[PDB]
Amino acid sequence: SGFRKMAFPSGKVEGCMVQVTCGTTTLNGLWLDDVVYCPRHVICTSEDMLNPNYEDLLIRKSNHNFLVQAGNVQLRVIGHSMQNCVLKLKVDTANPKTPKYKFVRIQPGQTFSVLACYNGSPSGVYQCAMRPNFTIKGSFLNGSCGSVGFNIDYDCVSFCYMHHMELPTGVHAGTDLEGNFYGPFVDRQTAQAAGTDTTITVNVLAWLYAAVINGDRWFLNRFTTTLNDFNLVAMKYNYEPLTQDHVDILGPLSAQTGIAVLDMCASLKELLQNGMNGRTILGSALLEDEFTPFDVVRQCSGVTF
Ligand SMILES: O=C1C[C@@H](C(=O)Nc2ccc(I)cc2)c2ccccc2N1
């Protein structure tokens, strides 16, 4: 039994993090095959970060102005392009540790493991979620730029996130590996406000389902509710509106626990209206929304990659 916030084994991604240096700036890069991906803000000075013209800055930069180092090995850059907000550096050697990879753009509410790095070496790995405002609440210090988020499909590492900037609010924003920012965020040191962050209701229901599987059953009520009426309560407490698609995704969990979705949604309504009265669910005095329904069935059924 037991239920903890798990992250995918970072081994396959460790053999792909390299160090990227342009002038004075040094951040982490992703070396897949013969290409190195890194945030394009590596090409700016400290003054340019206010209003940077990246296309003009890249024009002045040649191949010999970029330094790629995988551990203690300098890779010779042969071509530099700029796909959206990602700098693509064509190196000479194909990474012999490139796994079966795939570039995906995750939807809000999905979770992914982050391998935080500095100067090309991994420091730690944690599991975070894509907030509905297209931000993430992670731990990144200076030099963490270029740290990648990923999911592992048994053998295929699905790269989905690359850290770019910490918003002044303390949250973090990034792009997919194609360069497109997750959200309305541009790469410049300017007052950028995120949207209103809701609570992933479907993920909370999966977390409540995980609690029933792992012992905790105090929140289970004798009541039930309908979909629209529960959404009227979810709107009050800034919770994501629930759809029939979410009910069917929670289908596998509902069958294993013998508790219908609308009956679990009723137990959630009481927790939103009456609080928790100082109790705890799976060691948490607050409702958790960083576990997708697929993350629960991974830990509650047992699969390996
Ligand atoms: O998450 C982080 C990562 C790191 C950072 O990304 N800097 C940054 C770089 C380019 C732009 I354009 C905008 C921002 C950082 C440096 C110093 C203090 C806190 C943080 N927090």
Who's near 172: CB < 8 A, 6+ residues apart?
135, 136, 137, 138, 140, 163, 165, 166
For residue 203, give the DSSP letter. H
Strands annotated E in 40-85:
66-70, 73-75, 77-83
Structure token pair of residue 105: 């753009």
If you measure from the C-alpha of residue 166 to the centroid of ligand 1, how many angstroms do you get, rounded to a whole number? 5
Would you say the CB of residue 166 lies under 6 angstroms from ligand 1? Answer: yes
DSSP class per residue in 8-26: --THHHHTTEEEEEETTEE
How far apart are alpha carbons 91 and 81 in whole angstroms?
A: 12
Would you say the CB of residue 189 lies under 6 angstroms from ligand 1? Answer: yes
From 46, 86, 123, 142, mutation site for ligand 1 pocket: most ligand atoms within 8 A of C-beta: 142
Would you say the CB of residue 40 lies under 6 angstroms from ligand 1? Answer: no
Closest CA to 74 of 143, 19, 146: 19
Strand bridging mode 86-91 / 77-83: antiparallel
| CATH number for 206 | 1.10.1840.10
Closest CA to 204 of 135, 268, 278, 157: 268
Closest CA to 61 of 44, 75, 84, 83: 44
Instruction: Give, using CA atoms, the residue closest to atom 6 of ligand 1.
Output: 165
Strands annotated E in 135-226:
148-153, 156-166, 172-175
How far apart are alpha carbons 132 and 286 in whole angstroms?
A: 18
| CATH number for 42 | 2.40.10.10
CA 263 to chain centre: 30
If you measure from the C-alpha of residue 239 to the centroid of ligand 1, how many angstroms do you get, rounded to a whole number? 30
How far apart are alpha carbons 82 and 89 in whole angstroms?
A: 9
How far apart are alpha carbons 267 and 209 in whole angstroms?
A: 11
* Class of residue 135 by CB neighbours under 10 A (exposed 0-12, middle 13-18, buried 19+): buried
How far apart are alpha carbons 39 and 29 in whole angstroms?
A: 8
Residue 205 phi/psi, 5-degree rounding, is -65, -40
206 within 8 A of 295, measured Cβ to Cβ: yes
How far apart are alpha carbons 18 and 216 in whole angstroms?
A: 44
Distance (Å) of CA 248 to CA 185, 202, 244, 260, 273 = 33, 11, 6, 11, 25
How far apart are alpha carbons 12 and 3 in whole angstroms?
A: 24
From 57, 87, 148, 166, mutation site for ligand 1 pocket: most ligand atoms within 8 A of C-beta: 166
Active site residues: 41, 143, 145
Instruction: Give, using CA atoms, the residue closest to atom 12 of ligand 1.
Output: 188
Domain that holds residue 269: 201-300
Instruction: Give, using CA atoms, the residue closest to atom 14 of ligand 1.
Output: 165
Instruction: Give, using CA atoms, the residue closest to atom 10 of ligand 1.
Output: 165
Who's near 10: CB < 8 A, 6+ residues apart?
113, 115, 122, 125
191 within 8 A of 175, measured Cβ to Cβ: no
Would you say the CB of residue 192 lies under 6 angstroms from ligand 1? Answer: no
How far apart are alpha carbons 35 and 94 in whole angstroms?
A: 8
* Class of residue 225 by CB neighbours under 10 A (exposed 0-12, middle 13-18, buried 19+): buried
Structure token pair of residue 187: 């790469």
133 within 8 A of 173, measured Cβ to Cβ: no
How far apart are alpha carbons 89 and 19 in whole angstroms?
A: 12
Name the helix (H) or strand (E) containing 116.
strand 111-118
* Experimental method reported for this structure: X-ray
Residue 279 phi/psi, 5-degree rounding, is -85, -175
Closest ligand 1 atom to residue 166 Cα is 1
Who's near 287: CB < 8 A, 6+ residues apart?
199, 204, 207, 268, 271, 281
